[PDB]
Every structure is written in structure tokens, then in C-alpha cells.
Amino acid sequence: NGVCIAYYITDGRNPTFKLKDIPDKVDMVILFGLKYWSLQDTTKLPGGTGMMGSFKSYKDLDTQIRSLQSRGIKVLQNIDDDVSWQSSKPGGFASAAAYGDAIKSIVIDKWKLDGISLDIEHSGAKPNPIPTFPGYAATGYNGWYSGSMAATPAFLNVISELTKYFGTTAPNNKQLQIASGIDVYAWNKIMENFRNNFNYIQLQSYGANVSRTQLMMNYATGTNKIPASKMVFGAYAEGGTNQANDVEVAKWTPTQGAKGGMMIYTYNSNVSYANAVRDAVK
């Protein structure tokens, strides 16, 4: 009985399925598409347009978030890694600490959200040297995803600071999750430093079958030393074609033991598909 984490992409797709319509048996919802700077300054992106396409206004967004929270559903904000994370001025702020304070201020202090999920896969400087990727048998991936970036000290500093406000060692039960892949350059170092801080570690195993997710588990647990209970696999509801496999993975218990659960990308993209995966994991 793992967790069921729902991504709700805020681009206005399937508009009749509102954020507040997330059904029961869904533990958390991650606002995706919408950017943290929009939460920071609500005047730049008009409601009902772009990444606010799913809401009539910011008041509508705010009201719907509370509807979910009062039902006991945790609402998290997605935050993408960025090349500025490899710089001394992450997110334009003066330091990683300033950046950390800023995210806490916007996500927690202002919007009263339950945490953040880091989508780690964006471009930036690659590691030097580039290690030889372990390969498919060892990880469930063929090689490096060349569009990702190195977890340089500056990059790790950002996550370290976020760790003071989000995650297992931070106060006020705030979620800190990561959505990435073993094929992302930054993966290994992120895990060496913060695996224990993440409540959940999501693998973007979209379209995988149990065999493949098990290869991932072997590595995540054995080599990255990640507790099996934090592992969450990705159900690509948006694709609408891998439901049977996703359901198998949802009900599946890795050889390493009970996994954390499943995340659905995106719940609002295909509700029937999402409901099926939710049912399977619950």
C-alpha cells in the first residue's frame, strides 16, 4: 500500500477536471507547470492563461489548494533545477542560502503549501570527466541523459539549503521530493548527500514494465543506498497507453521490499488511467 502522488499540470488541459477534483486515495498533489516565481509575484502571469490556464484567477487557485489540504491531501510545488544552481547566484538570489530562504518564503510562508518536488533534469555544465554510465542491466537505462547537468558543489549547496525547510530533517512536516532518473548526471551525488532528506524519490520511469523498474531498484538501493520505502515510480497517464504495465508496477513489491508508491504524470491528463493506477497502488 504505497503512496499515490498526483501531478496536476496547470496548463488548462481537461479544464472541467479542476485541481479540487482530485479524488480520494490520492495522498499528495504536485502543482506542475506553474512556476514558483508566479506564486512569488502573481501579477506577471494572468490567471487563466499559460501555466495558470487551469484557474480563473489566483484566488481560484488559492481556494482550490485549500479544498485539497482540508481533505488531508498534501499540495507541493514543483521546482525545476536550473543552470543558475551551478552558479553563485541560484535563481538570481545572492547565494544558495538566499535562494533557500526565498523558496521557503514563497512556498511555505506565503502560499502555505506542504512542500516541494525537485524536477532534476535540466541543462547546464556536464560533469568533468563524464563517468562511464553503468549501462542497462545495472540501472534500467542505456546511458546518460545528455540534457542534464552536473551536481557541482554550488548545485548541491542549493539542495542542502532547501533541506533546512523541506524534507525529513526539517520542521513542520514539509515534503521534499525529487523527480529524476538514474541517467541524470546529478543523480549519484544528490543521493550521496540527500537521499535521507527526501520523503520520496520519484523515478521518471514513464512507460516502463516491472522488469525495468526492478533494474532501477537494484541500483537505487544497492549502489545509491536509497531506502526502498522512498522509491516512487512514474505512471505516464498523459501517454494513455501504458496502463496495464503501470498497474503492474503499482501493485508490485520490489525484491528489495515495499516501495514508496507511485506518482502519476499527469492525473488531470487522463483521469480514468490515473484512477486505475491509484487503485492499483492502494
XYZ file of N, CA, C and O in Angstrom, residues 66-233:
672
model
N -6.684 24.945 -0.860
C -7.195 24.709 0.490
C -8.222 23.583 0.537
O -8.314 22.874 1.535
N -8.995 23.428 -0.543
C -10.009 22.374 -0.622
C -9.319 21.020 -0.512
O -9.784 20.119 0.186
N -8.204 20.888 -1.210
C -7.417 19.661 -1.181
C -6.773 19.491 0.207
O -6.842 18.423 0.817
N -6.153 20.551 0.716
C -5.482 20.459 2.014
C -6.419 20.117 3.176
O -6.059 19.343 4.067
N -7.626 20.674 3.161
C -8.545 20.398 4.258
C -9.091 18.965 4.209
O -9.715 18.498 5.161
N -8.818 18.271 3.102
C -9.212 16.874 2.937
C -8.017 16.010 3.330
O -8.049 14.779 3.218
N -6.959 16.668 3.795
C -5.770 15.961 4.229
C -4.777 15.635 3.132
O -3.836 14.880 3.372
N -4.978 16.206 1.946
C -4.108 15.972 0.797
C -2.968 17.001 0.807
O -3.220 18.201 0.910
N -1.723 16.535 0.716
C -0.583 17.449 0.721
C -0.405 18.051 -0.676
O -0.431 17.341 -1.688
N -0.233 19.364 -0.734
C -0.066 20.027 -2.016
C 1.353 20.577 -2.072
O 1.760 21.379 -1.228
N 2.116 20.099 -3.056
C 3.504 20.515 -3.224
C 3.694 21.323 -4.485
O 2.924 21.203 -5.432
N 4.742 22.133 -4.490
C 5.068 22.940 -5.646
C 6.276 22.332 -6.356
O 7.291 22.010 -5.726
N 6.168 22.179 -7.670
C 7.273 21.642 -8.449
C 8.296 22.748 -8.654
O 7.936 23.888 -8.948
N 9.566 22.398 -8.500
C 10.661 23.340 -8.712
C 11.705 22.644 -9.570
O 12.228 21.594 -9.197
N 11.991 23.231 -10.726
C 12.963 22.670 -11.669
C 14.387 23.056 -11.314
O 14.627 24.184 -10.867
N 15.340 22.148 -11.517
C 16.708 22.575 -11.283
C 17.015 23.491 -12.464
O 16.323 23.455 -13.495
N 18.000 24.354 -12.290
C 18.344 25.317 -13.327
C 19.848 25.505 -13.379
O 20.536 25.244 -12.405
N 20.370 25.950 -14.515
C 21.811 26.142 -14.631
C 22.314 27.150 -13.590
O 23.471 27.086 -13.171
N 21.454 28.076 -13.162
C 21.872 29.062 -12.161
C 22.230 28.364 -10.845
O 22.938 28.925 -10.008
N 21.745 27.138 -10.661
C 22.080 26.379 -9.458
C 23.594 26.082 -9.426
O 24.163 25.907 -8.356
N 24.233 26.017 -10.595
C 25.674 25.759 -10.676
C 26.491 27.053 -10.459
O 27.725 27.029 -10.428
N 25.778 28.164 -10.302
C 26.382 29.489 -10.105
C 26.317 29.953 -8.646
O 25.705 29.305 -7.806
N 26.946 31.090 -8.351
C 26.942 31.625 -7.005
C 25.655 32.405 -6.735
O 25.418 32.859 -5.616
N 24.826 32.561 -7.764
C 23.569 33.291 -7.620
C 22.412 32.441 -8.126
O 21.805 32.735 -9.155
N 22.089 31.362 -7.402
C 20.990 30.489 -7.822
C 19.671 31.245 -7.856
O 19.380 32.004 -6.947
N 18.882 31.039 -8.908
C 17.598 31.712 -9.025
C 17.689 33.231 -9.027
O 16.676 33.914 -8.884
N 18.899 33.755 -9.187
C 19.094 35.194 -9.194
C 19.351 35.744 -7.802
O 19.685 36.925 -7.636
N 19.203 34.893 -6.795
C 19.424 35.317 -5.421
C 20.917 35.414 -5.116
O 21.748 34.932 -5.893
N 21.257 36.045 -3.994
C 22.659 36.267 -3.629
C 23.493 35.032 -3.309
O 24.723 35.058 -3.420
N 22.831 33.956 -2.905
C 23.529 32.735 -2.537
C 22.517 31.600 -2.455
O 21.310 31.822 -2.561
N 23.019 30.384 -2.256
C 22.156 29.221 -2.131
C 21.262 29.407 -0.908
O 20.113 29.000 -0.909
N 21.810 30.015 0.144
C 21.045 30.254 1.368
C 19.905 31.236 1.097
O 18.783 31.043 1.577
N 20.194 32.280 0.331
C 19.189 33.281 -0.013
C 18.118 32.612 -0.869
O 16.920 32.873 -0.710
N 18.551 31.750 -1.781
C 17.620 31.030 -2.644
C 16.729 30.143 -1.773
O 15.509 30.139 -1.924
N 17.356 29.394 -0.868
C 16.612 28.540 0.043
C 15.573 29.339 0.818
O 14.413 28.929 0.892
N 15.985 30.471 1.390
C 15.063 31.328 2.154
C 13.902 31.772 1.284
O 12.753 31.845 1.730
N 14.223 32.118 0.031
C 13.225 32.589 -0.910
C 12.164 31.530 -1.201
O 10.969 31.824 -1.171
N 12.591 30.301 -1.477
C 11.630 29.238 -1.768
C 10.751 28.984 -0.546
O 9.538 28.829 -0.666
N 11.365 28.946 0.632
C 10.625 28.753 1.874
C 9.583 29.875 2.022
O 8.419 29.624 2.318
N 10.013 31.111 1.795
C 9.130 32.266 1.916
C 7.934 32.218 0.970
O 6.815 32.535 1.353
N 8.176 31.820 -0.275
C 7.121 31.761 -1.280
C 6.191 30.561 -1.099
O 4.968 30.705 -1.030
N 6.785 29.375 -1.028
C 6.040 28.131 -0.929
C 5.385 27.890 0.419
O 4.210 27.539 0.487
N 6.147 28.085 1.486
C 5.629 27.860 2.819
C 4.999 29.100 3.427
O 3.796 29.143 3.620
N 5.802 30.123 3.704
C 5.282 31.324 4.351
C 4.106 32.019 3.684
O 3.118 32.354 4.350
N 4.200 32.237 2.375
C 3.136 32.916 1.649
C 1.986 31.993 1.273
O 0.858 32.179 1.724
N 2.281 30.985 0.459
C 1.256 30.070 -0.020
C 0.852 28.909 0.871
O -0.078 28.176 0.538
N 1.535 28.736 2.000
C 1.193 27.667 2.937
C 1.074 26.282 2.289
O 0.173 25.498 2.621
N 1.977 25.988 1.364
C 1.990 24.694 0.697
C 2.696 23.669 1.594
O 3.354 24.025 2.581
N 2.569 22.395 1.238
C 3.132 21.322 2.043
C 4.527 20.848 1.699
O 5.063 19.951 2.346
N 5.125 21.466 0.692
C 6.472 21.090 0.319
C 6.750 21.349 -1.142
O 5.990 22.038 -1.840
N 7.846 20.773 -1.611
C 8.261 20.947 -2.987
C 8.784 19.642 -3.520
O 9.168 18.760 -2.751
N 8.776 19.532 -4.844
C 9.290 18.360 -5.537
C 10.254 18.933 -6.557
O 9.885 19.814 -7.348
N 11.490 18.451 -6.530
C 12.511 18.947 -7.452
C 12.598 18.122 -8.721
O 12.901 16.932 -8.683
N 12.302 18.765 -9.843
C 12.364 18.111 -11.148
C 13.796 18.354 -11.608
O 14.120 19.424 -12.132
N 14.644 17.355 -11.394
C 16.067 17.423 -11.699
C 16.391 16.751 -13.029
O 16.452 15.521 -13.112
N 16.601 17.556 -14.066
C 16.904 17.020 -15.390
C 17.260 18.114 -16.398
O 17.468 17.819 -17.570
N 17.338 19.360 -15.955
C 17.601 20.446 -16.889
C 19.060 20.646 -17.271
O 19.962 20.143 -16.604
N 19.289 21.369 -18.365
C 20.646 21.539 -18.868
C 21.548 22.518 -18.146
O 21.113 23.523 -17.589
N 22.827 22.189 -18.166
C 23.829 23.006 -17.514
C 25.144 22.327 -17.801
O 25.193 21.398 -18.611
N 26.205 22.774 -17.146
C 27.522 22.184 -17.364
C 27.527 20.702 -16.986
O 27.034 20.311 -15.925
N 28.099 19.888 -17.860
C 28.183 18.456 -17.626
C 29.360 18.159 -16.709
O 30.266 18.985 -16.558
N 29.364 16.971 -16.082
C 30.482 16.642 -15.197
C 31.759 16.530 -16.010
O 31.715 16.311 -17.220
N 32.893 16.687 -15.339
C 34.192 16.575 -15.991
C 35.137 15.877 -15.027
O 35.508 16.435 -13.997
N 35.544 14.650 -15.354
C 35.143 13.959 -16.582
C 33.727 13.401 -16.464
O 33.121 13.434 -15.390
N 33.201 12.906 -17.576
C 31.891 12.288 -17.564
C 32.158 10.820 -17.228
O 32.820 10.116 -17.996
N 31.648 10.343 -16.078
C 31.873 8.942 -15.696
C 31.290 7.994 -16.729
O 30.432 8.385 -17.513
N 31.765 6.750 -16.750
C 31.213 5.782 -17.687
C 29.902 5.300 -17.060
O 29.902 4.730 -15.979
N 28.785 5.546 -17.731
C 27.499 5.111 -17.190
C 27.473 3.574 -17.075
O 27.932 2.875 -17.978
N 26.950 3.038 -15.952
C 26.862 1.591 -15.700
C 26.151 0.749 -16.757
O 26.456 -0.430 -16.913
N 25.195 1.335 -17.468
C 24.514 0.585 -18.503
C 23.154 0.044 -18.115
O 22.765 0.086 -16.943
N 22.445 -0.489 -19.104
C 21.094 -1.006 -18.913
C 20.890 -2.087 -17.850
O 20.041 -1.947 -16.968
N 21.649 -3.173 -17.934
C 21.497 -4.246 -16.958
C 21.623 -3.736 -15.520
O 20.865 -4.134 -14.646
N 22.574 -2.835 -15.290
C 22.810 -2.305 -13.955
C 21.822 -1.244 -13.459
O 21.565 -1.147 -12.261
N 21.236 -0.481 -14.379
C 20.369 0.628 -13.975
C 18.971 0.736 -14.579
O 18.124 1.457 -14.047
N 18.736 0.056 -15.699
C 17.450 0.181 -16.359
C 17.506 1.327 -17.367
O 16.479 1.707 -17.948
N 18.700 1.902 -17.550
C 18.942 2.987 -18.512
C 20.173 2.631 -19.349
O 21.121 2.038 -18.848
N 20.172 3.031 -20.617
C 21.290 2.748 -21.515
C 22.529 3.596 -21.284
O 23.663 3.118 -21.386
N 22.304 4.867 -20.997
C 23.407 5.776 -20.773
C 22.889 7.082 -20.215
O 21.698 7.219 -19.901
N 23.793 8.048 -20.105
C 23.468 9.361 -19.573
C 22.434 10.108 -20.394
O 22.360 9.958 -21.616
N 21.624 10.910 -19.714
C 20.661 11.737 -20.417
C 21.507 13.005 -20.598
O 21.737 13.753 -19.641
N 21.994 13.228 -21.816
C 22.885 14.358 -22.095
C 22.341 15.760 -21.868
O 23.107 16.727 -21.898
N 21.034 15.869 -21.647
C 20.433 17.170 -21.405
C 20.380 17.573 -19.939
O 19.763 18.592 -19.596
N 21.002 16.779 -19.067
C 21.011 17.101 -17.645
C 22.321 17.796 -17.273
O 23.152 18.069 -18.144
N 22.520 18.085 -15.988
C 23.738 18.777 -15.565
C 24.415 18.153 -14.352
O 23.812 17.355 -13.630
N 25.664 18.545 -14.128
C 26.440 18.024 -13.012
C 26.009 18.611 -11.677
O 25.636 19.779 -11.584
N 26.073 17.780 -10.647
C 25.756 18.212 -9.298
C 27.079 18.734 -8.737
O 27.779 18.051 -7.986
N 27.434 19.946 -9.153
C 28.664 20.587 -8.706
C 28.411 21.033 -7.274
O 27.287 20.961 -6.789
N 29.461 21.465 -6.564
C 29.265 21.919 -5.182
C 28.180 22.993 -5.067
O 27.348 22.949 -4.162
N 28.187 23.950 -5.988
C 27.190 25.019 -5.983
C 25.783 24.430 -6.101
O 24.856 24.849 -5.404
N 25.638 23.463 -7.002
C 24.359 22.793 -7.242
C 23.899 22.097 -5.959
O 22.743 22.232 -5.545
N 24.810 21.370 -5.319
C 24.480 20.657 -4.080
C 24.134 21.626 -2.945
O 23.313 21.307 -2.080
N 24.764 22.802 -2.954
C 24.513 23.835 -1.946
C 23.036 24.235 -1.979
O 22.426 24.471 -0.944
N 22.470 24.327 -3.172
C 21.067 24.708 -3.287
C 20.180 23.672 -2.595
O 19.339 24.008 -1.758
N 20.366 22.407 -2.936
C 19.544 21.381 -2.316
C 19.785 21.345 -0.805
O 18.845 21.227 -0.042
N 21.039 21.475 -0.385
C 21.377 21.484 1.040
C 20.554 22.548 1.791
O 19.967 22.279 2.844
N 20.523 23.766 1.262
C 19.764 24.824 1.915
C 18.259 24.515 1.948
O 17.597 24.757 2.954
N 17.722 23.964 0.860
C 16.296 23.637 0.788
C 15.953 22.615 1.871
O 14.874 22.592 2.438
N 16.925 21.765 2.135
C 16.835 20.707 3.113
C 16.556 21.251 4.543
O 16.092 20.524 5.432
N 16.821 22.538 4.770
C 16.566 23.114 6.089
C 15.077 23.389 6.302
O 14.622 23.516 7.442
N 14.330 23.483 5.210
C 12.909 23.805 5.280
C 11.996 22.735 4.728
O 10.807 22.737 5.013
N 12.545 21.851 3.912
C 11.756 20.789 3.301
C 12.411 19.445 3.526
O 13.638 19.329 3.486
N 11.597 18.425 3.754
C 12.165 17.104 3.930
C 12.127 16.554 5.332
O 11.634 17.200 6.268
N 12.695 15.358 5.461
C 12.700 14.616 6.710
C 13.431 15.200 7.903
O 13.169 14.790 9.026
N 14.336 16.141 7.683
C 15.060 16.727 8.812
C 14.621 18.160 9.091
O 15.166 18.815 9.978
N 13.635 18.639 8.336
C 13.133 20.000 8.508
C 11.891 20.026 9.397
O 11.181 19.035 9.513
N 11.611 21.170 10.040
C 10.430 21.233 10.902
C 9.106 21.405 10.145
O 9.088 21.661 8.941
N 8.005 21.229 10.876
C 6.654 21.420 10.359
C 6.176 20.516 9.232
O 5.390 20.942 8.385
N 6.627 19.266 9.256
C 6.271 18.257 8.267
C 6.064 18.787 6.860
O 4.936 18.838 6.340
N 7.174 19.176 6.248
C 7.167 19.678 4.885
C 7.817 18.614 4.012
O 8.825 18.014 4.392
N 7.235 18.395 2.842
C 7.733 17.402 1.904
C 8.895 17.924 1.076
O 8.929 19.099 0.706
N 9.853 17.042 0.807
C 10.960 17.348 -0.089
C 11.035 16.083 -0.942
O 11.315 14.986 -0.439
N 10.745 16.221 -2.229
C 10.803 15.073 -3.113
C 11.659 15.451 -4.308
O 11.993 16.627 -4.503
N 12.029 14.448 -5.088
C 12.810 14.665 -6.286
C 12.192 13.781 -7.357
O 11.718 12.669 -7.071
N 12.155 14.302 -8.576
C 11.635 13.563 -9.721
C 12.814 13.621 -10.668
O 13.195 14.694 -11.156
N 13.431 12.473 -10.918
C 14.597 12.466 -11.778
C 14.788 11.077 -12.359
O 13.821 10.311 -12.499
N 16.034 10.774 -12.710
C 16.358 9.475 -13.269
C 17.784 9.119 -12.930
O 18.617 9.996 -12.681
N 18.088 7.832 -12.908
C 19.450 7.419 -12.610
C 20.380 7.903 -13.721
O 21.583 8.038 -13.511
N 19.810 8.193 -14.894
C 20.596 8.652 -16.039
C 20.926 10.152 -16.037
O 21.529 10.663 -16.988
N 20.525 10.850 -14.979
C 20.805 12.283 -14.860
C 22.163 12.399 -14.171
O 22.415 11.741 -13.156
N 23.047 13.227 -14.714
C 24.390 13.334 -14.145
C 24.419 13.570 -12.658
O 25.220 12.960 -11.949
N 23.547 14.458 -12.201
C 23.479 14.848 -10.796
C 22.950 13.792 -9.831
O 23.145 13.918 -8.621
N 22.313 12.752 -10.356
C 21.716 11.716 -9.518
C 22.590 11.162 -8.396
O 22.244 11.248 -7.221
N 23.723 10.581 -8.764
C 24.586 9.968 -7.765
C 24.987 10.890 -6.621
O 24.872 10.507 -5.455
N 25.452 12.098 -6.938
C 25.867 12.994 -5.870
C 24.697 13.491 -5.042
O 24.838 13.704 -3.837
N 23.541 13.679 -5.677
C 22.377 14.112 -4.925
C 22.055 13.048 -3.875
O 21.784 13.365 -2.714
N 22.112 11.784 -4.278
C 21.801 10.685 -3.373
C 22.844 10.493 -2.284
O 22.494 10.200 -1.133
N 24.117 10.664 -2.627
C 25.181 10.529 -1.627
C 24.978 11.538 -0.497
O 25.276 11.265 0.670
N 24.473 12.714 -0.862
C 24.265 13.791 0.087
C 22.888 13.928 0.711
O 22.767 14.270 1.885
N 21.848 13.666 -0.067
C 20.498 13.924 0.418
C 19.444 12.844 0.369
O 18.277 13.130 0.614
N 19.821 11.614 0.061
C 18.810 10.563 -0.012
C 17.917 10.470 1.221
O 16.721 10.188 1.105
N 18.482 10.709 2.398
C 17.700 10.612 3.618
C 16.761 11.782 3.831
O 15.763 11.659 4.533
N 17.082 12.914 3.213
C 16.259 14.111 3.332
C 14.957 14.017 2.532
O 13.941 14.575 2.930
N 14.992 13.334 1.395
C 13.774 13.201 0.590
C 12.743 12.266 1.243
O 13.080 11.169 1.698
N 11.489 12.695 1.291
C 10.426 11.850 1.819
C 10.206 10.777 0.759
O 9.976 9.608 1.074
N 10.266 11.211 -0.496
C 10.087 10.326 -1.637
C 10.995 10.717 -2.786
O 11.260 11.902 -3.037
N 11.457 9.682 -3.477
C 12.354 9.796 -4.604
C 11.651 9.158 -5.794
O 11.493 7.934 -5.862
N 11.198 10.011 -6.707
C 10.487 9.566 -7.894
C 11.393 9.345 -9.089
O 12.201 10.208 -9.443
N 11.226 8.193 -9.726
C 11.970 7.895 -10.932
C 10.968 8.116 -12.079
O 9.837 7.625 -12.037
N 11.386 8.870 -13.090
C 10.524 9.163 -14.238
C 10.567 7.988 -15.207
O 10.919 8.142 -16.373
N 10.197 6.818 -14.700
C 10.201 5.561 -15.447
C 8.971 5.435 -16.349
O 8.339 4.386 -16.405
N 8.646 6.504 -17.063
C 7.480 6.506 -17.938
C 7.512 5.429 -19.008
O 8.466 5.338 -19.784
N 6.451 4.621 -19.029
C 6.323 3.541 -19.994
C 7.102 2.288 -19.655
O 7.229 1.406 -20.489
N 7.623 2.189 -18.440
C 8.393 1.004 -18.071
C 7.503 -0.171 -17.688
O 6.283 -0.020 -17.544
N 8.116 -1.349 -17.561
C 7.390 -2.508 -17.067
C 8.090 -2.880 -15.753
O 9.105 -2.264 -15.377
N 7.534 -3.850 -15.037
C 8.098 -4.260 -13.762
C 9.562 -4.656 -13.850
O 10.361 -4.271 -12.990
N 9.929 -5.394 -14.896
C 11.315 -5.820 -15.045
C 12.237 -4.620 -15.037
O 13.243 -4.603 -14.325
N 11.885 -3.608 -15.825
C 12.713 -2.422 -15.900
C 12.774 -1.646 -14.592
O 13.846 -1.214 -14.177
N 11.635 -1.451 -13.939
C 11.658 -0.720 -12.685
C 12.450 -1.519 -11.642
O 13.038 -0.940 -10.734
N 12.474 -2.844 -11.772
C 13.247 -3.643 -10.820
C 14.748 -3.406 -11.070
O 15.533 -3.357 -10.125
N 15.158 -3.261 -12.330
C 16.572 -2.993 -12.605
C 16.949 -1.659 -11.935
O 18.029 -1.508 -11.353
N 16.044 -0.691 -12.023
C 16.272 0.611 -11.415
C 16.413 0.474 -9.901
O 17.302 1.068 -9.288
N 15.526 -0.314 -9.307
C 15.524 -0.549 -7.863
C 16.856 -1.156 -7.410
O 17.422 -0.760 -6.392
N 17.349 -2.123 -8.177
C 18.599 -2.796 -7.829
C 19.690 -1.771 -7.612
O 20.421 -1.828 -6.635
N 19.775 -0.822 -8.537
C 20.785 0.217 -8.483
C 20.509 1.265 -7.427
O 21.396 1.613 -6.638
N 19.284 1.780 -7.419
C 18.899 2.815 -6.471
C 19.171 2.369 -5.042
O 19.686 3.142 -4.233
N 18.842 1.115 -4.743
C 19.025 0.595 -3.389
C 20.440 0.124 -3.098
O 21.041 0.507 -2.092
N 20.967 -0.710 -3.989
C 22.283 -1.275 -3.782
C 23.453 -0.344 -3.947
O 24.365 -0.351 -3.126
N 23.432 0.456 -5.006
C 24.528 1.371 -5.283
C 24.299 2.774 -4.714
O 25.205 3.337 -4.094
N 23.104 3.331 -4.897
C 22.826 4.658 -4.353
C 22.470 4.603 -2.863
O 22.431 5.633 -2.184
N 22.191 3.399 -2.371
C 21.865 3.194 -0.961
C 20.563 3.839 -0.523
O 20.388 4.155 0.657
N 19.645 4.020 -1.464
C 18.364 4.641 -1.155
C 17.404 3.641 -0.529
O 17.273 2.524 -1.009
N 16.752 4.022 0.584
C 15.798 3.114 1.228
C 14.718 2.756 0.202
O 14.231 3.626 -0.524
N 14.338 1.490 0.138
C 13.329 1.073 -0.825
C 12.030 1.833 -0.605
O 11.338 2.171 -1.563
N 11.714 2.105 0.661
C 10.476 2.786 1.034
C 10.323 4.210 0.515
O 9.248 4.797 0.636
N 11.389 4.776 -0.042
C 11.305 6.132 -0.587
C 11.056 6.113 -2.098
O 10.656 7.127 -2.685
N 11.285 4.961 -2.719
C 11.160 4.847 -4.168
C 9.752 4.922 -4.716
O 8.872 4.155 -4.340
N 9.564 5.841 -5.649
C 8.267 6.036 -6.273
C 8.476 5.968 -7.786
O 9.394 6.582 -8.318
N 7.636 5.209 -8.475
C 7.783 5.078 -9.921
C 6.732 5.877 -10.682
O 5.665 6.182 -10.154
